[PDB]
Design a protein around this ligand. Structure first.
Ligand SMILES: Nc1nc(=O)n([C@@H]2O[C@H](COP(=O)(O)O)[C@@H](O)[C@H]2O)cc1CO
Ligand SMILES: Nc1nc(=O)n([C@@H]2O[C@H](COP(=O)(O)O)[C@@H](O)[C@H]2O)cc1CO
Lengths: 318, 319
């Protein structure tokens, strides 16, 4: 049990690095591995990694989470934030097991909106043990040479003592890279669902069949291990309308069809929390489309976001 | 980490009974509960509970595991061994989320045989992290007033250092009743698959979202904790499918009382000893359920673990 994700993250990293149960190479990828590893987070909202050596990218974090909420399988959206992700796209325009959006909101086994069913289930029976969103699909193993098989099995939500608790079940997780965005996204969905239901946030449990550090990340992992402000709360109630507007801005900014000044960002008809997210996308637009870094944009952000930007793009925001 | 399932079972039962995290009533069923609970078993073949006050039923345990291997959703098969399982059947004919057989061998999503796909995946890439059998299905929550939603999410197998390791992921598990048969069946599947692949048996990991004791079982759970050996036999090496097919033939004939076998007939069956003993369990159960003469010579030839289970479960017949 840990207070924040960062504590759990570093502890797990040091477990796998120092005492791997196995060294092997699934699909030719040499790794240090532990089996059946998990942890419990007391404050899932504190979901960010702030160790400068890790250079955690809060823009990608929100982008992935919102990509999931959009229900999209499209590569163009997500690869703009994570260029290496195209390696998992067979067709060069969609992602398959990597795209959790369709798994949540239109699962290929029946075309089911599981999020809605979870909400209904917990509304009809608050104590329910059945409120599960399945991610993995039985057909992913049926075809050979599949380059993108879902590594998350399911996400479960439970209301306990008036608080929404979350559990992520994974068959496999990159403990150094992927875990950072996976735990961010799962706890983001947990918080989002809690606000929708009018509940407080409980604990988050993470459990994984194979947790591993790829040997190709060993140097960077070592640098993070040698190294050594609060994440803001999402506003109460139904955030879908705000998410819809944020997604409109995301696309306009990503395609460089529009740009927002510090004053224009503050003028947006959005809660402060979501204004800052759009601000992250404007900052990312400045990077990607080589536009002038706005220091006034930077100064208005929550400190956690300022730090992430300054460390990730020090030439722009340092 | 525990050596045997009994050690893990008793430790967990004590945790939930005496130190529950929550008290609630999902679907109106008052319970003591802990969230995010699991264990590791170093010796998954030792999968049985022998505490007399628990009255663990080894015949049901094998019947459930074989019911799964048969790929069947039929109620008639399984309710013969566990009459109370009828409560989860909406049609009096089949089970839905309780029936893991079809989920494994012809999953609702595509009709996929996931066991075959797991074996192929591990054959092509021994180190694979992908060898998962999905159990749960997204349509189960879309069924209005569903009385039988799968509580197992998935089973995963990994080949590590020449051993097959197993992981059972469940959204919910009854710590008193269900856990006994679930861990039996999952470790049975694990062993069966290891033998088929020519591997030794690795660790078994059990991971559960909600682990609970129902208040209706509190008195019995207390008797077990207040009350608190011989080894469980190993399944033969190699491909056991042919033996399983033969055992399922005998299972059907004995259950329907369409056949019966004496102790000497059982001993002379053309099966490995391990599987002969399982057929004998079914013959013993037939004697009980169809009111035939108990064969004490049958009882005497069984492994001690099975003798004990029969003696405690049916003391009037085998005590
Ligand atoms: N969300 C994810 N988390 C992750 O940790 N991964 C990583 O990508 C790997 C996919 O390779 P396998 O299908 O061989 O497990 C996982 O083992 C895991 O290390 C991938 C995704 C999907 O992009
Ligand atoms: N294999 C099983 N193990 C189990 O432990 N169960 C128990 O049956 C309950 C089913 O009710 P829910 O769908 O409300 O979780 C589970 O919570 C669990 O307590 C049921 C089955 C299938 O009949």
């Amino acid at each position: 049990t840990f207070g924040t994700f960062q504590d759990a993250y570093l502890s797990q990293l040091r477990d796998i690095y120092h005492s791997p149960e196995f060294r092997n190479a699934p699909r030719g990828q040499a790794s240090r591995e532990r089996i059946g590893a998990g942890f419990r987070l007391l404050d899932p909202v504190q979901r960010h990694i702030s160790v400068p050596a890790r250079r955690a990218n809060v823009v990608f974090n929100f982008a992935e989470a919102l990509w999931y909420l959009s229900g999209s399988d499209r590569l163009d959206f997500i690869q703009y934030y994570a260029p290496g992700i195209a390696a998992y796209s067979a067709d060069g325009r969609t992602l398959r097991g990597t795209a959790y959006g369709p798994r949540i909101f239109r699962h290929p086994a029946g075309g089911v909106n599981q999020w809605e069913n979870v909400v209904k289930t917990l509304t009809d029976d608050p104590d329910s043990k059945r409120a599960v969103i399945q991610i993995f699909d039985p057909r992913e193993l049926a075809v050979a040479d599949n380059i993108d098989v879902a590594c998350t099995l399911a996400l479960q939500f439970l209301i306990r003592d008036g608080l929404l608790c979350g559990i992520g079940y994974m068959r496999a997780n990159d403990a150094f890279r992927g875990a950072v965005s996976d735990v961010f996204s799962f706890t983001f969905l947990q918080e989002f669902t809690a606000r929708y239901l009018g509940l407080g946030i409980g604990t988050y449990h993470h459990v994984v069949g194979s947790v591993h550090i790829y040997d190709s990340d060993a140097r960077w992992a070592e640098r993070v291990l040698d190294a050594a402000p609060g994440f803001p709360a999402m506003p109460d109630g139904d955030n879908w309308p705000h998410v819809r507007r944020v997604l409109e801005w995301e696309e306009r900014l990503r395609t460089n069809a529009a740009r927002l000044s510090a004053d224009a960002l503050d003028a947006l008809d959005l809660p402060a929390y979501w204004k800052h997210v759009v601000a992250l996308f404007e900052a990312h637009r400045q990077v990607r489309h080589e536009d002038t870094p706005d220091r006034a944009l930077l100064a208005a952000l929550p400190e956690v976001y300022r730090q992430s930007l300054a460390v990730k793009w020090p030439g722009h925001f340092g």
